[PDB]
PDB file of C-alpha atoms in Angstrom:
ATOM      1  CA  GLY A   1     -12.868  27.520   0.113  1.00 19.79           C
ATOM      2  CA  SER A   2     -13.081  24.580  -2.266  1.00 18.33           C
ATOM      3  CA  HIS A   3     -11.775  24.591  -5.837  1.00 17.92           C
ATOM      4  CA  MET A   4     -13.798  21.592  -6.997  1.00 16.60           C
ATOM      5  CA  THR A   5     -15.622  23.231  -9.894  1.00 19.02           C
ATOM      6  CA  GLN A   6     -13.127  25.939 -10.779  1.00 17.94           C
ATOM      7  CA  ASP A   7      -9.432  26.046 -11.539  1.00 17.75           C
ATOM      8  CA  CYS A   8      -7.071  24.331  -9.107  1.00 17.72           C
ATOM      9  CA  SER A   9      -5.180  27.394  -7.912  1.00 20.70           C
ATOM     10  CA  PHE A  10      -4.577  29.064  -4.569  1.00 22.86           C
ATOM     11  CA  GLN A  11      -4.751  32.725  -3.571  1.00 26.14           C
ATOM     12  CA  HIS A  12      -3.045  32.185  -0.197  1.00 26.09           C
ATOM     13  CA  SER A  13      -0.113  29.829   0.266  1.00 25.46           C
ATOM     14  CA  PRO A  14      -1.345  26.541   1.835  1.00 27.00           C
ATOM     15  CA  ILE A  15       2.247  25.556   2.642  1.00 29.33           C
ATOM     16  CA  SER A  16       3.707  27.261   5.706  1.00 31.40           C
ATOM     17  CA  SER A  17       7.394  28.105   6.238  1.00 32.38           C
ATOM     18  CA  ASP A  18       7.910  25.325   8.786  1.00 31.73           C
ATOM     19  CA  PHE A  19       6.631  22.263   6.889  1.00 29.96           C
ATOM     20  CA  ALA A  20      10.008  20.553   7.160  1.00 31.15           C
ATOM     21  CA  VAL A  21      10.117  20.806  10.977  1.00 31.41           C
ATOM     22  CA  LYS A  22       6.549  19.465  11.196  1.00 31.05           C
ATOM     23  CA  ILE A  23       7.346  16.476   9.048  1.00 36.61           C
ATOM     24  CA  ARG A  24      10.607  15.723  10.815  1.00 34.99           C
ATOM     25  CA  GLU A  25       8.837  15.859  14.192  1.00 36.42           C
ATOM     26  CA  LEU A  26       6.227  13.265  13.152  1.00 36.79           C
ATOM     27  CA  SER A  27       8.942  11.005  11.719  1.00 33.03           C
ATOM     28  CA  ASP A  28      11.075  11.215  14.862  1.00 33.34           C
ATOM     29  CA  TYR A  29       8.250  10.497  17.383  1.00 34.48           C
ATOM     30  CA  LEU A  30       6.275   7.820  15.502  1.00 32.56           C
ATOM     31  CA  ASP A  31       5.625   4.851  17.779  1.00 29.75           C
ATOM     32  CA  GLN A  32       5.946   2.311  14.938  1.00 29.01           C
ATOM     33  CA  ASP A  33       6.852   2.430  11.234  1.00 28.33           C
ATOM     34  CA  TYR A  34       3.429   1.967   9.644  1.00 27.46           C
ATOM     35  CA  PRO A  35       3.306   0.190   6.236  1.00 29.36           C
ATOM     36  CA  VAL A  36       2.313   2.491   3.356  1.00 29.71           C
ATOM     37  CA  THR A  37       2.842   2.833  -0.372  1.00 28.66           C
ATOM     38  CA  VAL A  38       4.317   5.235  -2.903  1.00 25.46           C
ATOM     39  CA  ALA A  39       3.677   5.314  -6.651  1.00 26.20           C
ATOM     40  CA  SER A  40       6.565   3.785  -8.610  1.00 26.37           C
ATOM     41  CA  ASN A  41       5.829   4.928 -12.188  1.00 25.17           C
ATOM     42  CA  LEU A  42       4.403   8.437 -12.051  1.00 23.74           C
ATOM     43  CA  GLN A  43       5.286  10.627 -15.058  1.00 21.21           C
ATOM     44  CA  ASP A  44       8.374  12.601 -14.051  1.00 21.64           C
ATOM     45  CA  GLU A  45       7.014  16.149 -13.851  1.00 22.52           C
ATOM     46  CA  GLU A  46       8.345  18.227 -10.976  1.00 24.67           C
ATOM     47  CA  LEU A  47       5.269  20.330 -10.322  1.00 26.89           C
ATOM     48  CA  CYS A  48       2.345  18.093 -11.364  1.00 26.46           C
ATOM     49  CA  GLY A  49       4.306  15.130 -10.048  1.00 25.71           C
ATOM     50  CA  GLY A  50       4.687  16.791  -6.686  1.00 24.85           C
ATOM     51  CA  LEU A  51       0.945  17.336  -6.487  1.00 27.00           C
ATOM     52  CA  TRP A  52       0.270  13.744  -7.522  1.00 30.32           C
ATOM     53  CA  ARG A  53       2.533  12.429  -4.801  1.00 29.05           C
ATOM     54  CA  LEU A  54       0.917  14.741  -2.218  1.00 28.22           C
ATOM     55  CA  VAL A  55      -2.612  13.545  -3.248  1.00 27.78           C
ATOM     56  CA  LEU A  56      -1.495  10.032  -2.471  1.00 25.44           C
ATOM     57  CA  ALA A  57       0.404  10.985   0.675  1.00 25.71           C
ATOM     58  CA  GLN A  58      -2.570  13.024   2.019  1.00 24.03           C
ATOM     59  CA  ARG A  59      -4.808   9.974   1.747  1.00 20.59           C
ATOM     60  CA  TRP A  60      -2.289   7.955   3.751  1.00 19.56           C
ATOM     61  CA  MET A  61      -2.198  10.640   6.426  1.00 20.21           C
ATOM     62  CA  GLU A  62      -5.971  10.413   6.849  1.00 20.85           C
ATOM     63  CA  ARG A  63      -5.813   6.603   6.942  1.00 23.01           C
ATOM     64  CA  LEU A  64      -3.141   6.674   9.586  1.00 22.35           C
ATOM     65  CA  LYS A  65      -5.324   8.853  11.836  1.00 24.90           C
ATOM     66  CA  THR A  66      -7.737   5.948  11.912  1.00 24.98           C
ATOM     67  CA  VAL A  67      -5.147   3.422  13.156  1.00 23.46           C
ATOM     68  CA  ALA A  68      -2.648   5.477  15.255  1.00 24.61           C
ATOM     69  CA  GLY A  69      -3.483   6.136  18.830  1.00 22.30           C
ATOM     70  CA  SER A  70      -4.388   9.312  20.629  1.00 20.70           C
ATOM     71  CA  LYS A  71      -0.836  10.480  21.158  1.00 21.04           C
ATOM     72  CA  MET A  72      -0.046  10.632  17.436  1.00 19.94           C
ATOM     73  CA  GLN A  73      -3.104  12.640  16.331  1.00 20.49           C
ATOM     74  CA  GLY A  74      -1.607  16.076  16.796  1.00 23.00           C
ATOM     75  CA  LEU A  75       1.663  15.187  15.003  1.00 21.96           C
ATOM     76  CA  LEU A  76      -0.238  13.548  12.142  1.00 16.41           C
ATOM     77  CA  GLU A  77      -2.605  16.494  11.775  1.00 13.39           C
ATOM     78  CA  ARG A  78       0.278  18.937  11.654  1.00 14.53           C
ATOM     79  CA  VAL A  79       1.530  17.164   8.528  1.00 14.00           C
ATOM     80  CA  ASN A  80      -1.991  16.834   7.146  1.00 13.27           C
ATOM     81  CA  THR A  81      -2.427  20.608   7.370  1.00 13.01           C
ATOM     82  CA  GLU A  82       0.582  21.214   5.102  1.00 13.28           C
ATOM     83  CA  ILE A  83      -0.772  18.933   2.373  1.00 14.54           C
ATOM     84  CA  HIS A  84      -4.583  19.048   2.851  1.00 16.31           C
ATOM     85  CA  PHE A  85      -4.959  21.690   0.125  1.00 20.91           C
ATOM     86  CA  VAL A  86      -4.876  19.047  -2.606  1.00 23.48           C
ATOM     87  CA  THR A  87      -8.308  17.919  -1.427  1.00 23.15           C
ATOM     88  CA  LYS A  88      -9.755  21.213  -2.591  1.00 23.51           C
ATOM     89  CA  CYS A  89      -9.077  20.356  -6.247  1.00 26.33           C
ATOM     90  CA  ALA A  90     -10.953  17.865  -8.395  1.00 26.02           C
ATOM     91  CA  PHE A  91      -8.123  15.338  -8.757  1.00 27.31           C
ATOM     92  CA  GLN A  92      -9.341  12.429 -10.780  1.00 29.73           C
ATOM     93  CA  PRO A  93      -9.013   8.743  -9.907  1.00 26.24           C
ATOM     94  CA  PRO A  94      -5.606   7.203 -10.554  1.00 26.29           C
ATOM     95  CA  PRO A  95      -5.273   5.488 -13.893  1.00 25.52           C
ATOM     96  CA  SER A  96      -5.106   1.716 -14.190  1.00 24.75           C
ATOM     97  CA  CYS A  97      -1.488   1.984 -15.402  1.00 28.89           C
ATOM     98  CA  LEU A  98      -0.314   3.222 -11.958  1.00 30.94           C
ATOM     99  CA  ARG A  99       2.087   0.963 -10.014  1.00 29.56           C
ATOM    100  CA  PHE A 100       3.194   1.125  -6.379  1.00 31.06           C
ATOM    101  CA  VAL A 101       5.903  -0.017  -3.997  1.00 30.08           C
ATOM    102  CA  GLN A 102       5.202  -0.893  -0.361  1.00 27.88           C
ATOM    103  CA  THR A 103       7.389   1.139   1.975  1.00 29.77           C
ATOM    104  CA  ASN A 104       7.421   2.643   5.423  1.00 31.56           C
ATOM    105  CA  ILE A 105       5.929   5.845   6.705  1.00 31.24           C
ATOM    106  CA  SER A 106       9.377   7.364   7.325  1.00 28.65           C
ATOM    107  CA  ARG A 107      10.211   7.147   3.589  1.00 29.16           C
ATOM    108  CA  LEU A 108       6.820   8.563   2.627  1.00 26.61           C
ATOM    109  CA  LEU A 109       7.413  11.501   4.969  1.00 25.79           C
ATOM    110  CA  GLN A 110      10.829  12.194   3.484  1.00 25.61           C
ATOM    111  CA  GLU A 111       9.321  12.118  -0.049  1.00 26.41           C
ATOM    112  CA  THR A 112       6.534  14.436   1.103  1.00 24.94           C
ATOM    113  CA  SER A 113       8.953  17.008   2.461  1.00 26.47           C
ATOM    114  CA  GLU A 114      10.812  16.942  -0.846  1.00 25.80           C
ATOM    115  CA  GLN A 115       7.672  17.649  -2.819  1.00 23.37           C
ATOM    116  CA  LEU A 116       6.829  20.629  -0.631  1.00 25.58           C
ATOM    117  CA  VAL A 117      10.301  22.129  -1.142  1.00 28.33           C
ATOM    118  CA  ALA A 118       9.715  21.872  -4.904  1.00 27.95           C
ATOM    119  CA  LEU A 119       6.152  23.217  -4.815  1.00 29.02           C
ATOM    120  CA  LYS A 120       6.434  25.972  -2.210  1.00 29.77           C
ATOM    121  CA  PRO A 121       7.594  28.813  -4.520  1.00 30.74           C
ATOM    122  CA  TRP A 122       5.076  27.780  -7.177  1.00 29.53           C
ATOM    123  CA  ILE A 123       1.992  26.947  -5.116  1.00 29.65           C
ATOM    124  CA  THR A 124       0.202  30.167  -5.191  1.00 29.40           C
ATOM    125  CA  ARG A 125       1.614  31.313  -8.613  1.00 27.20           C
ATOM    126  CA  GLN A 126       0.129  28.738 -11.023  1.00 27.77           C
ATOM    127  CA  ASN A 127      -3.067  27.243 -12.334  1.00 27.27           C
ATOM    128  CA  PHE A 128      -2.621  23.511 -11.570  1.00 29.17           C
ATOM    129  CA  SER A 129      -5.800  22.342 -13.352  1.00 28.12           C
ATOM    130  CA  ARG A 130      -3.482  20.636 -15.877  1.00 25.32           C
ATOM    131  CA  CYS A 131      -2.387  18.253 -13.048  1.00 24.79           C
ATOM    132  CA  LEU A 132      -5.805  16.857 -12.034  1.00 24.75           C
ATOM    133  CA  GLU A 133      -5.237  13.618 -14.050  1.00 25.13           C
ATOM    134  CA  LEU A 134      -2.344  11.521 -12.727  1.00 23.52           C
ATOM    135  CA  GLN A 135      -0.024  10.290 -15.465  1.00 25.50           C
ATOM    136  CA  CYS A 136       2.265   7.252 -15.700  1.00 23.10           C
ATOM    137  CA  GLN A 137       5.625   6.770 -17.324  1.00 21.45           C
ATOM    138  CA  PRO A 138       5.602   4.545 -20.421  1.00 23.94           C
TER     139      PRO A 138
ATOM    140  CA  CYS B   1      10.336 -26.835   0.426  1.00 25.03           C
ATOM    141  CA  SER B   2       7.887 -29.687   0.986  1.00 26.65           C
ATOM    142  CA  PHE B   3       5.345 -30.743   3.590  1.00 28.56           C
ATOM    143  CA  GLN B   4       4.689 -34.089   5.259  1.00 31.76           C
ATOM    144  CA  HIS B   5       1.205 -33.109   6.515  1.00 32.12           C
ATOM    145  CA  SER B   6      -1.128 -30.716   4.685  1.00 32.29           C
ATOM    146  CA  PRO B   7      -0.680 -27.173   6.068  1.00 33.14           C
ATOM    147  CA  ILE B   8      -3.990 -26.050   4.512  1.00 31.32           C
ATOM    148  CA  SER B   9      -7.119 -26.987   6.458  1.00 31.96           C
ATOM    149  CA  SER B  10     -10.439 -27.922   4.866  1.00 33.50           C
ATOM    150  CA  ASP B  11     -12.173 -24.713   5.920  1.00 33.66           C
ATOM    151  CA  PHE B  12      -9.746 -22.045   4.655  1.00 35.02           C
ATOM    152  CA  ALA B  13     -12.456 -20.457   2.527  1.00 37.60           C
ATOM    153  CA  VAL B  14     -14.832 -19.896   5.473  1.00 38.98           C
ATOM    154  CA  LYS B  15     -11.986 -18.338   7.520  1.00 39.06           C
ATOM    155  CA  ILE B  16     -11.021 -15.942   4.744  1.00 38.71           C
ATOM    156  CA  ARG B  17     -14.685 -15.013   4.080  1.00 40.20           C
ATOM    157  CA  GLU B  18     -15.193 -14.242   7.748  1.00 41.17           C
ATOM    158  CA  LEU B  19     -12.253 -11.822   7.796  1.00 42.16           C
ATOM    159  CA  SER B  20     -13.352 -10.173   4.549  1.00 39.35           C
ATOM    160  CA  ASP B  21     -16.940  -9.634   5.616  1.00 39.48           C
ATOM    161  CA  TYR B  22     -16.317  -8.279   9.119  1.00 36.12           C
ATOM    162  CA  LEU B  23     -13.117  -6.307   8.512  1.00 32.98           C
ATOM    163  CA  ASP B  24     -13.677  -3.345  10.784  1.00 32.31           C
ATOM    164  CA  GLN B  25     -11.401  -0.945   8.907  1.00 28.62           C
ATOM    165  CA  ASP B  26      -9.952  -1.125   5.421  1.00 26.86           C
ATOM    166  CA  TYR B  27      -6.256  -0.345   4.962  1.00 27.90           C
ATOM    167  CA  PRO B  28      -4.644  -0.318   1.457  1.00 29.67           C
ATOM    168  CA  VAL B  29      -2.574  -3.300   0.535  1.00 27.89           C
ATOM    169  CA  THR B  30      -0.682  -4.425  -2.583  1.00 29.43           C
ATOM    170  CA  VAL B  31      -0.789  -7.408  -4.935  1.00 26.76           C
ATOM    171  CA  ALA B  32       1.724  -8.227  -7.679  1.00 27.48           C
ATOM    172  CA  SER B  33       0.804  -7.060 -11.198  1.00 29.03           C
ATOM    173  CA  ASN B  34       3.297  -9.021 -13.287  1.00 30.35           C
ATOM    174  CA  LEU B  35       4.028 -12.400 -11.715  1.00 29.62           C
ATOM    175  CA  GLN B  36       4.728 -15.214 -14.167  1.00 30.98           C
ATOM    176  CA  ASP B  37       1.503 -17.148 -14.713  1.00 31.72           C
ATOM    177  CA  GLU B  38       2.366 -20.441 -13.079  1.00 34.55           C
ATOM    178  CA  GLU B  39      -0.568 -22.008 -11.290  1.00 31.08           C
ATOM    179  CA  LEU B  40       1.299 -23.724  -8.492  1.00 30.50           C
ATOM    180  CA  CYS B  41       4.518 -21.721  -8.085  1.00 31.23           C
ATOM    181  CA  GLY B  42       2.448 -18.625  -8.756  1.00 29.38           C
ATOM    182  CA  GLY B  43       0.053 -19.554  -5.998  1.00 27.85           C
ATOM    183  CA  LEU B  44       2.942 -19.907  -3.592  1.00 26.56           C
ATOM    184  CA  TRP B  45       4.443 -16.558  -4.679  1.00 24.77           C
ATOM    185  CA  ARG B  46       1.104 -14.818  -4.118  1.00 27.02           C
ATOM    186  CA  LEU B  47       0.765 -16.457  -0.686  1.00 27.02           C
ATOM    187  CA  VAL B  48       4.330 -15.387   0.373  1.00 26.29           C
ATOM    188  CA  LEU B  49       3.352 -11.800  -0.441  1.00 23.52           C
ATOM    189  CA  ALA B  50      -0.138 -12.152   1.187  1.00 19.59           C
ATOM    190  CA  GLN B  51       1.310 -13.706   4.358  1.00 20.37           C
ATOM    191  CA  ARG B  52       3.619 -10.717   4.843  1.00 23.91           C
ATOM    192  CA  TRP B  53       0.535  -8.466   4.532  1.00 25.70           C
ATOM    193  CA  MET B  54      -1.329 -10.497   7.175  1.00 24.83           C
ATOM    194  CA  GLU B  55       1.510  -9.825   9.578  1.00 28.05           C
ATOM    195  CA  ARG B  56       1.605  -6.134   8.646  1.00 28.00           C
ATOM    196  CA  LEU B  57      -2.148  -5.764   9.161  1.00 26.56           C
ATOM    197  CA  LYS B  58      -1.854  -7.178  12.719  1.00 26.77           C
ATOM    198  CA  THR B  59       0.330  -4.122  13.475  1.00 26.84           C
ATOM    199  CA  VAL B  60      -2.411  -1.646  12.383  1.00 24.74           C
ATOM    200  CA  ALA B  61      -5.679  -3.451  13.144  1.00 23.60           C
ATOM    201  CA  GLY B  62      -7.445  -3.153  16.436  1.00 24.36           C
ATOM    202  CA  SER B  63      -7.759  -5.735  19.168  1.00 27.30           C
ATOM    203  CA  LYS B  64     -11.045  -7.142  17.774  1.00 25.82           C
ATOM    204  CA  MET B  65      -9.494  -8.084  14.439  1.00 26.14           C
ATOM    205  CA  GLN B  66      -6.514 -10.051  15.726  1.00 25.48           C
ATOM    206  CA  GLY B  67      -8.318 -13.363  15.932  1.00 24.62           C
ATOM    207  CA  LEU B  68      -9.795 -13.020  12.425  1.00 26.49           C
ATOM    208  CA  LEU B  69      -6.411 -12.022  10.961  1.00 26.47           C
ATOM    209  CA  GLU B  70      -4.560 -14.803  12.738  1.00 29.23           C
ATOM    210  CA  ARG B  71      -7.068 -17.401  11.521  1.00 31.09           C
ATOM    211  CA  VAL B  72      -6.099 -16.500   7.968  1.00 30.13           C
ATOM    212  CA  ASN B  73      -2.428 -16.243   8.814  1.00 25.92           C
ATOM    213  CA  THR B  74      -2.518 -19.850  10.064  1.00 29.14           C
ATOM    214  CA  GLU B  75      -3.819 -21.072   6.716  1.00 29.67           C
ATOM    215  CA  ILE B  76      -0.959 -19.549   4.743  1.00 30.37           C
ATOM    216  CA  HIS B  77       1.887 -19.355   7.332  1.00 30.34           C
ATOM    217  CA  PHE B  78       3.435 -22.515   5.896  1.00 29.54           C
ATOM    218  CA  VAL B  79       5.233 -20.451   3.230  1.00 30.60           C
ATOM    219  CA  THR B  80       7.537 -19.093   5.946  1.00 29.37           C
ATOM    220  CA  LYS B  81       9.062 -22.538   6.329  1.00 31.95           C
ATOM    221  CA  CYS B  82      10.636 -22.363   2.839  1.00 32.89           C
ATOM    222  CA  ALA B  83      13.578 -20.203   1.840  1.00 34.58           C
ATOM    223  CA  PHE B  84      11.761 -17.977  -0.601  1.00 35.32           C
ATOM    224  CA  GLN B  85      14.213 -15.501  -2.112  1.00 36.57           C
ATOM    225  CA  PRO B  86      13.851 -11.716  -2.287  1.00 37.92           C
ATOM    226  CA  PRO B  87      11.596 -10.606  -5.146  1.00 38.86           C
ATOM    227  CA  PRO B  88      13.329  -9.655  -8.393  1.00 36.15           C
ATOM    228  CA  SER B  89      13.532  -6.016  -9.454  1.00 40.07           C
ATOM    229  CA  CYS B  90      11.142  -6.661 -12.380  1.00 39.77           C
ATOM    230  CA  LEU B  91       8.252  -7.355  -9.965  1.00 40.92           C
ATOM    231  CA  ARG B  92       5.617  -4.606  -9.871  1.00 39.03           C
ATOM    232  CA  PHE B  93       2.532  -4.051  -7.713  1.00 37.20           C
ATOM    233  CA  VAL B  94      -0.871  -2.450  -7.717  1.00 38.99           C
ATOM    234  CA  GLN B  95      -2.575  -0.911  -4.679  1.00 36.25           C
ATOM    235  CA  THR B  96      -5.819  -2.657  -3.819  1.00 31.43           C
ATOM    236  CA  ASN B  97      -8.134  -3.390  -0.937  1.00 31.97           C
ATOM    237  CA  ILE B  98      -7.995  -6.167   1.606  1.00 29.71           C
ATOM    238  CA  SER B  99     -11.068  -7.831   0.139  1.00 33.38           C
ATOM    239  CA  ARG B 100      -9.306  -8.293  -3.186  1.00 35.10           C
ATOM    240  CA  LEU B 101      -6.133  -9.598  -1.520  1.00 33.55           C
ATOM    241  CA  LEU B 102      -8.277 -12.083   0.435  1.00 31.98           C
ATOM    242  CA  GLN B 103     -10.172 -13.279  -2.663  1.00 32.11           C
ATOM    243  CA  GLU B 104      -6.854 -13.835  -4.426  1.00 33.04           C
ATOM    244  CA  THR B 105      -5.558 -15.742  -1.384  1.00 37.95           C
ATOM    245  CA  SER B 106      -8.567 -18.035  -1.300  1.00 38.97           C
ATOM    246  CA  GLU B 107      -8.133 -18.744  -5.007  1.00 35.80           C
ATOM    247  CA  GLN B 108      -4.491 -19.748  -4.543  1.00 34.40           C
ATOM    248  CA  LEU B 109      -5.388 -22.112  -1.739  1.00 37.25           C
ATOM    249  CA  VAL B 110      -8.043 -23.877  -3.864  1.00 36.93           C
ATOM    250  CA  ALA B 111      -5.389 -24.436  -6.525  1.00 35.41           C
ATOM    251  CA  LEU B 112      -2.674 -25.581  -4.118  1.00 31.61           C
ATOM    252  CA  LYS B 113      -4.589 -27.765  -1.659  1.00 31.84           C
ATOM    253  CA  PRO B 114      -4.396 -31.067  -3.604  1.00 33.38           C
ATOM    254  CA  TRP B 115      -0.735 -30.485  -4.388  1.00 33.12           C
ATOM    255  CA  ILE B 116       0.726 -29.178  -1.133  1.00 33.88           C
ATOM    256  CA  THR B 117       1.719 -32.458   0.550  1.00 32.51           C
ATOM    257  CA  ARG B 118       2.781 -34.295  -2.550  1.00 34.96           C
ATOM    258  CA  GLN B 119       5.195 -31.897  -4.217  1.00 33.70           C
ATOM    259  CA  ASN B 120       8.743 -30.616  -3.835  1.00 32.30           C
ATOM    260  CA  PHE B 121       8.324 -26.854  -4.314  1.00 32.19           C
ATOM    261  CA  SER B 122      12.018 -25.877  -4.186  1.00 30.81           C
ATOM    262  CA  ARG B 123      11.618 -24.889  -7.872  1.00 30.14           C
ATOM    263  CA  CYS B 124       9.382 -22.024  -6.683  1.00 29.45           C
ATOM    264  CA  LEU B 125      11.800 -20.272  -4.289  1.00 32.06           C
ATOM    265  CA  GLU B 126      12.609 -17.543  -6.823  1.00 31.27           C
ATOM    266  CA  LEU B 127       9.665 -15.367  -7.841  1.00 32.21           C
ATOM    267  CA  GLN B 128       9.424 -14.826 -11.599  1.00 33.38           C
ATOM    268  CA  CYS B 129       7.928 -12.011 -13.706  1.00 29.88           C
ATOM    269  CA  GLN B 130       5.863 -12.194 -16.877  1.00 25.96           C
ATOM    270  CA  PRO B 131       7.606 -11.325 -20.189  1.00 22.45           C
TER     271      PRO B 131
END
């Protein structure tokens, strides 16, 4: 269920063993290299920073479902399912300090896979309420 | 980087407004956060960046938007005729919506329109950041 009023923590792992294969499959079969963004000045925390990058990536995945054709929906949703859990927490709006770089979906997917590798052993073990506010580097 | 005939038509603002108002689907875009505050070179720098977004949006917008997008592209495509250089590493960006990008674009064209056929703009080919 949702975690919108309570602590941002997970009793069952939302990240499956085969996230890397799912992400590599979408990246290999994409029909075009859609223009997206990544944050450029997030505070360099491994765990919170992974969640922050997944919050942003998850929004891109939903956006792409609205512009990619039929044939991409299953591949896109497979990646969405590995990262959709962040929507269950009350992440707050990004701060005005946040900066971005425009890049391509392939780079975003690579970054996403890297965050899941970092988060997977931790995801069900921690209270991540401390991460709901995105932070920038000075 | 100079123009013998004005590449900006009288009705740019109506064309941009039409795209903004009837945009069928929003898609995040970027604008620069720390460009040097030059009115004329700065307008050109913002249009170089906006014109690349117009081309990107054609690759994600549906059939019905292509005419609206191209009508704006034609108003700002003249920047592709100059040898603008790759942005410097200092340049940073914010994520925003197409409406904001379009309002910024219209504002640059109002500033540039009286100057565009008179001036040599070679001094603008390198984008500059604020201190």
